[PDB]
């Protein structure tokens, strides 16, 4: 399955994407294998970023025991910029499993926050 390559950059730079950041296909990059457990790392194939699972997504991710390599499709989400524009997060309220334990599309992706620290003018 193909990921939504570079979509994390689109979420914070494109207004129509920022306003409705759903339908993206992403790979779980890292998890803390409570509350901290809802904070995961996800990959779009180019960039990796933090995602905060909330509501039915937090309950689903936990019961399904999802982990690094699993590919998900985001259904309900909100973008969020915190700590004086330094930290980026995708608040995920709902998603579906697309593929379980897939091989990592990108092992050496760029942290989204590191990209926006070098290009601060691009963000909405």
């Amino acid at each position: 399955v193909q990921l939504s390559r570079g979509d994390f950059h689109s979420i914070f730079t494109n207004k129509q994407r920022y306003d409705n950041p759903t339908g993206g296909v992403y790979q779980v990059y890292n998890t803390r294998k409570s509350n901290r457990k809802n904070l995961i790392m996800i990959s779009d194939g180019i960039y990796h970023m933090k995602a905060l699972l909330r509501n039915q997504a937090a309950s689903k991710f936990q019961s399904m025991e999802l982990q690094r390599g699993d590919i998900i499709r985001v259904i309900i989400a909100e973008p969020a910029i915190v700590r004086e524009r330094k930290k980026y997060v995708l608040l995920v309220d709902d998603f579906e499993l697309v593929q379980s334990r897939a091989d990592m599309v990108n092992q050496t992706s760029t942290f989204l926050d590191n990209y926006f620290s070098e290009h601060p003018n691009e963000t909405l």
Binding site: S34, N35, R36, N38, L39, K50, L52, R54, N55, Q56, A58, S59, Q62, S63, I76, E78, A80, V82, R83, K87, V89, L91, D93, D94
Partner: protein, 98 residues
């Protein structure tokens, strides 16, 4: 720390389709809450039954009091009618001279 991110977990969601689901509770935790809720609902029911009983009793006492007050007023008017009937009878007896 990532506490500035974690504080968004309960932030009210934009979507009305995002529903809060509390973390799994074991059967032991749920049993205490459920037996607690049973005790509360049996108490609410006990108090509501008492309230329906009190209301019905009050309805009966108000009805009885109202009827007592009405009958006293009605009696007073009938006694005044009797007084006027007697006054006219006496005026007629006066007219025929006894």
């Amino acid at each position: 720390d990532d506490d500035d991110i974690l504080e968004l977990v309960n932030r009210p969601p934009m979507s009305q389709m995002a529903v809060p689901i509390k973390p799994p509770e074991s059967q032991a935790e749920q049993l205490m809450k459920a037996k607690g809720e049973v005790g509360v609902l049996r108490q609410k029911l006990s108090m509501l039954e008492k309230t329906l009983r009190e209301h019905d009793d009050n309805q009966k006492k108000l009805e009885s009091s109202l009827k007592s007050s009405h009958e006293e007023e009605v009696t007073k008017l009938k006694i005044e009618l009797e007084r006027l009937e007697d006054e006219r009878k006496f005026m007629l007896l006066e007219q025929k001279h006894l």
